[PDB]
Structure formats: C-alpha cells, structure tokens
Amino acid sequence: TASWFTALTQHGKEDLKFPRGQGVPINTNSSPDDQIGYYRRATSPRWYFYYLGTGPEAGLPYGANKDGIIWVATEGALNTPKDHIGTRNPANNAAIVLQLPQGTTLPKGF
Amino acid sequence: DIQMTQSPSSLSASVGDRVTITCRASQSIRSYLNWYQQKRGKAPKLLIYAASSLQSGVPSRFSGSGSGTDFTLTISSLQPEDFATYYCQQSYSTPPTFGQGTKVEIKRTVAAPSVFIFPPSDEQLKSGTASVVCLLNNFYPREAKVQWKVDNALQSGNSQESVTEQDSKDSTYSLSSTLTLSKADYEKHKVYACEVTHQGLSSPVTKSFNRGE
Amino acid sequence: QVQLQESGPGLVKPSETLSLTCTVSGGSISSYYWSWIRQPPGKGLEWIGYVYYSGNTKYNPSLKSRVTISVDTSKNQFSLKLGSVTAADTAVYYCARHSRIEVAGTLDFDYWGQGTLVTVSSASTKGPSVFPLAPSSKSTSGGTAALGCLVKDYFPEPVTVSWNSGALTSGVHTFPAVLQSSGLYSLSSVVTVPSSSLGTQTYICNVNHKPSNTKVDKRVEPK
Ligand SMILES: [Cl-]
Ligand SMILES: [Cl-]
Ligand SMILES: [Cl-]
Ligand SMILES: [Cl-]
Ligand SMILES: [Cl-]
Ligand SMILES: [Cl-]
Numbered sequence: 033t034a035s036w037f038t039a040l041t042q043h044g045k046e047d048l049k050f051p052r053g054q055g056v057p058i059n060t061n062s063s064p065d066d067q068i069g070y071y072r073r074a075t076s077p078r079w080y081f082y083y084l085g086t087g088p089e090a091g092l093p094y095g096a097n098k099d100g101i102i103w104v105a106t107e108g109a110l111n112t113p114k115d116h117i118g119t120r121n122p123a124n125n126a127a128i129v130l131q132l133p134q135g136t137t138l139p140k141g142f
Numbered sequence: 143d144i145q146m147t148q149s150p151s152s153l154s155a156s157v158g159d160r161v162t163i164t165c166r167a168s169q170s171i172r173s174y175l176n177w178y179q180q181k182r183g184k185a186p187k188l189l190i191y192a193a194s195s196l197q198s199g200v201p202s203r204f205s206g207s208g209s210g211t212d213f214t215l216t217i218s219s220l221q222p223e224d225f226a227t228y229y230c231q232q233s234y235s236t237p238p239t240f241g242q243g244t245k246v247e248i249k250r251t252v253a254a255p256s257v258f259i260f261p262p263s264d265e266q267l268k269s270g271t272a273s274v275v276c277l278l279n280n281f282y283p284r285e286a287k288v289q290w291k292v293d294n295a296l297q298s299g300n301s302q303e304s305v306t307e308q309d310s311k312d313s314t315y316s317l318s319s320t321l322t323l324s325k326a327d328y329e330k331h332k333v334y335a336c337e338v339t340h341q342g343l344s345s346p347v348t349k350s351f352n353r354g355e
Numbered sequence: 356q357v358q359l360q361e362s363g364p365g366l367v368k369p370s371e372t373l374s375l376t377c378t379v380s381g382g383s384i385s386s387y388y389w390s391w392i393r394q395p396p397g398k399g400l401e402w403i404g405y406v407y408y409s410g411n412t413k414y415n416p417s418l419k420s421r422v423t424i425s426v427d428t429s430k431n432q433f434s435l436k437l438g439s440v441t442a443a444d445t446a447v448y449y450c451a452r453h454s455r456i457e458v459a460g461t462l463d464f465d466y467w468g469q470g471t472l473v474t475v476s477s478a479s480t481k482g483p484s485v486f487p488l489a490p491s492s493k494s495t496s497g498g499t500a501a502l503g504c505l506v507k508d509y510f511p512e513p514v515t516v517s518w519n520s521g522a523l524t525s526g527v528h529t530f531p532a533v534l535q536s537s538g539l540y541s542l543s544s545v546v547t548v549p550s551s552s553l554g555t556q557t558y559i560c561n562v563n564h565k566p567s568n569t570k571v572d573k574r575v576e577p578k
Contacts, residue, residue, distance in 0.1 A: 053458045064411065068459050093173060093192065094456060107386065108407060109459040112174070112235055143416075176463050185449055185467035186400065197465070229400060233462035237415040240400040256547075258494035258501040266486040266505070275488055277501055277545055279528070302533040302541075316528045318543045320505075322535070351493050 034120045035087065037130040039078035040071065044141020048079045048102055051137050055104030057081050058131045064108035066117060073100035081130065085113025144168055144232050148241035154249040157313075161217040163244045165208075165230035173209045174234035179226045180243070182307045186229060190215065222248055225308045247284075248313040254342025255281035255317070257349045259335075262328065272328035276336035276349070278317040280309070287339040288319045291348075293331045297321060328353065357382035359450050359468035365566040366511055367444075367475050373437040377450030377468055384408050384431050388453035388460040391424060391435045393446040394470070401446075405453065406433050407460075440475045447472050474511035478538060482569030483509035485562050488545060490577045495550050502553075502575050503545030504560035508537070509567070516544040517561045553577045 037057045040048060048071055056067045062083075069083040070092065080087075081104075084094060094111050095103050105111075120127065132138070145168040155161045165175070173193035178186035188197045190206035193213060205216045217224055225248050230241040255278035262272035278286060284305065290297035303319040319336065335350035358380045367373045377389070391403040404414035406424045414422050418437070426433040437444060448471050451464040488494075488503035495501075506514050516529045523546060532542040544560055554577060562571045 064407070065413075091172065094459065103457075105457055105459045107458045108409075110388070111456050111459045111461045112233070113172075115235070174462070178464075185451075185470050186464070187467075188454075188463060188465050191454070191461070191463045231400075231462075231464075236402075236405075236413055236462070237417075238402045238462045240402075242399045256496050256499065258496065260488040260491075260494060260503070263486045263489065263505075266484075266507075269484070273486070273505055273507065273541070275503075275505065275543060277494070277503075279501065279545075279547055302535070304531040304533055306528045306530060316530075316545075318528075318530050318545065320533070320541065320543065322541075349493065 034122050035080035035082055035127070036117070036120045036125075037081050037128045039074070039080050040130060040142055042073075042077040042079060042141055044139075046139050046141055048073070048142065049139060050102070050104050053105070053107055054136045055102075055132070056106045056109075057128065058133065059128060062117065064106070065110040065112070066114055067106035068094065068109035068111065069104060069114070071102050071104065082119065083114035083117045084111070085115060086117060086119050143237060144171065144234065144239050146230055146232055146239055146241035148230060148244050150244060151242070152245040152247070154247050155220050156249045157220055157222055159220050161220050161224075161246060163215045163228055163246070165213040165215070165241050167211045167213075167232055170210050171232045171234035174232060175206070175208070175213050176231045176233055177206055177215045178229045178231065180229060181226050189228075191233070217246075220246075220248065222313050223310045224248070225310075225313075247308055250282050250313040252342045253280060253282045253314055255279060255286065255338060255340055257336060257338050257347060259349045259351055261334065261351055261353070267325055267328070270325050272323045272325055274321040274323075274334050276319045276321075276338075278338060278340075280312065280314040280316060281340060281342060282314050283341060284315045285341070286317055288317065289337045290319070290321045291333075291335040291337060291350075292321075293333050357452065357466050359452065359466055361448060361450055361468045361471040363565050364472045364511070364513060365474070366478070366480055367440050367473055368477050369441055369475055370439055373440050373444065373473055373475075374434070375448055375450075375471060375473070376432050376434040379431045379452075384426065384428050384433065387455065389426070389433050390451050390453065390464065392449045392451055392464070394449070395443075395446040403435065403437070442475050445473065445475045472511070472513055476511060478510055480567045481508065481510045481539065482564050482567035483507055483514060483562065483571070485560070485571045485573040487573060487575040488543065489575060490548075490553050495553075498550050499547050500550045500553055501545055501547050502558055502577075503543055504562065504573050504575060505541070505543050506562050507541045508535075508539045509564050509569075510539050511566055512540055513565075514540075514542055515563045515565075516542070518544070518546055519557070519559055520561060523558070
C-alpha cells in the first residue's frame, strides 16, 4: 500500500507548503469533489500525497496540525474521506508521475 | 447508506439542568457529524459541526462530543428557549443522512389551564355550519383531556384539537378543541359545554354557554 | 448575511413533476455547493441532492431515477425537479448551502431557506373563510379575555396569521391546522388580552393563504 503518485523531493531546508487551493496532484481518474488530501514526509526528504481519509494518516481530518503533514485542496473539493480511491498496490499499478497545474507555487528546493 | 439512531426520542428537563442527547452511527464516521436545532415551522439551524465545533453565533451552553460511532449533544444549562427537535447528521459520505430527532421540552411547575369557550359566529351560521371552540390557555404539563357535552350528551369522534409549541417565556402550552355541527343540528340543542381534566385542577371543570345567549 | 428563499407553497398533482427554485441573496452561488433537503410532515430530514455552481450534481440513490437539479449563476438561483410524485413526496422542501473549509465544501448545511410545503394531491387549491372568535363573558375570566379568528375550509396548507399587522405579538397562539373529514383544513388563532382593552384596542387578524393568493384582514369585535 503506497501513494498513488511519485514523491516531491525536498532539496532545501524548508518544509513543503502550498497556497490555499494549490498542491493536489493531477489525476484524471478522479473527480472535482475528490481533490483534497495531505502530503506526508516519509519516515533529502520525500513528500508523498494521499487523498483525505486514506494512507498512513487516514484517520486525520483536514487541517490537523502534525509535524511532517501538510494539507492541500482544490476549489470544488468536498471534505469527505476518499474511501473509494484508497491507496495504490504497486504490484497492480504504477505510480502516477506527480504533476501540478501550471502556475502552482512551489517553494525553493522543490 | 449510513443509519443514524438518536435517543431518547423525547425528554423533559428543568431550566438550568444539563441535557445530553445521544446519536449513534451504523458505521464509524470519526468526527464527521453535525447537530441541528429545529423549532416548529422553521428550518434547522446548525449548532455543532465536526462533532464538537461550535457554529459561530450559537450559545456556548451547546457542546458536542464523540468520534467514531457514539456522539452526544449537551446543553449544559437548559434555557426556556431551548425547546426544539434536535437532529444529528453524518457528514462522512453521500448521501448525508439524519437521525430521527430528539424532542426537548422544558419541565416546569404544574399550571392549570384557563378555559374559554366560543359559540359559532353569526357569520358562520349564515353560511350553514357551526364551529364551537374551546380554548385551554397557559397550562403545564401538556397532557389534558377535553370533552364536549351537548345537552349533556358526551360527544365522541366529533371534535378535533391541536396544541401550540411550548411558550419561550413561561414554558406553558395552549390547546384548542373544535366541535363542528351543521346549522340544523346546532339549532336542535341548547347547552354547549367543554369539560376539562388536567393535573393542575383539583377536579374536572366545565365551561358552557346556551345557544342564543 | 446570506439569505435563501424557496418558491411559494402549493399543490402538485400525483404523477406530475414538482418544480422549485431557490433564490440566493446577500451572497453568491459561485464556489459553494447547494442542496435540496426535504421533511415530510411529522418526520425527519431527507437529503435529495446537491449541485456545484458549475453544474455538476449528485443525487440521493433513492431518488436518482426521477430528480434533476440545475443551477443558473446569472440569476443566483438553483432549482429542483422531482418527477412522478406521490403522497410520499408531500414534504417541506428546503434549499441549503454547504459550508466551506478553506477552498473545500463540506456536507455541513450552514444556511437554509425558510422551507416550502409541497402537498401532493389531486384536489383543488381553495382559500379560507375567516370567522371571528368574538370575546364575550364566556371568554373573559376576570381580567383576561380571549378572542381570535377561525380560518376554515382551505386547501392545501399552510396559512399564516398575524395580528394588527404584526404589532400584536404578546399572548398570540396560532394553532396547528387540523384536517377535517371534508379534506379541507381549519385553523384557529387566538390572543389573550386585558379585559379593559375590549372595544378600545382594535383587533384584526391578518390571514394569508399563499397557495390561493387569498389575504383577509378580519376585525374581531366583542359580542
Ligand atoms: Cl490539530
Ligand atoms: Cl478502495
Ligand atoms: Cl464500522
Ligand atoms: Cl449560553
Ligand atoms: Cl460521546
Ligand atoms: Cl398519491
């Protein structure tokens, strides 16, 4: 059980963060209400995206303050767990190359 | 779908008492749980979201608790304006589903009804029917028996009644009962009486009029 | 403050289509989710479906086969169509806004309309007659007198009653309507007043039956 996407690698000293409305990776197999979740720093730090209510912090509600967790959402998302998406079995599915919409702020080091 | 089960279905509590009502889900919903207040004839009003967050503007005597399947709504000091039906609602997945509600009334001291009776108006009589109305004003508790007697014959099945919401100031109820007859039947009888039985009264009481004053 | 307003109450005939519109003011449709929610008389609440401002919808599976929800941002409105209705569809229909958390919507309904009662029935819309419940010795116990209006033989619900154009609220009791064996409703509204005010204060009940567009102001005098 894995993230659906490849990682964001942190080459600098700043934690990952995004402006409100930014940071959810593109996934055309998902719908506008689905576009909400968290990045988790693993364990150069690698940060992996998980849809809300899935993955290692599936129990956290949106906005929970935890070191190594940041929250992201896109306009149109619904704040409901994405049990229908869940996580990725790497034996069954390749990781989606993490892709952000054009114009997204990325902090230095990413 | 997710089934929400509220208990109790109704309760009475005194002003200044703590009230705690329960809502239980058929599957874990973590803290995705809202509470609403609904007054008679009004839309629900959001009180609590995310199981325990107080909605802005809602008095701080309202709280929520629980995460998973077992939730409570607490009114820590019940106020006279807090009578309502309270509903929970899971916000975890579509379709959002609501509990069946808990009705809260304010318990207060016994108060006997004032009893009033209204003959049919001349305007209604001119149109061919007669409605006789009995009013019970400002009583507690809600339970009351109101019987109609027409020239001392007990009426059974000939009248309908309804009851107001609890009053937000004095926590009492009022009730009206209506006996409807044809004009021809109204004119066959003399004494129209409302008999009232209530905990606040030593014994049943009767108020009447004679047709034609 | 944001305000939501459903279209007016009234009848829909069995097997026909219920149509309602919600008009939003003091705020914008854009960026929020909006739902229709209904409440049969004496029962709890049932979510019908939501619409996002750009047009996507989601419906309760129990209703999906016969419901559409649409949205019109240029009119700041959204609307419900519910087909093939039966008496099980008689209910107060509410429009409601979903709250937001950051840019996400929730399933938390933070603003609601007033509610519009839709009665599914083949019967005709019929306005009430208004009769006085005149104060007399038999409705005057000492220093308190009771008077009222009897609002009789209308269909469907609801009626609204005020007194003295809203200037009289203390002591007013407007009772739930009763369904008579004729299939028409009747309702009473009463006020208790000081006995010395009889013949001094004018008492007028203001009756509105929106389904039939019937409005009556009835003066209630003693004797
Ligand atoms: Cl937190
Ligand atoms: Cl799954
Ligand atoms: Cl479970
Ligand atoms: Cl308080
Ligand atoms: Cl609890
Ligand atoms: Cl039907």
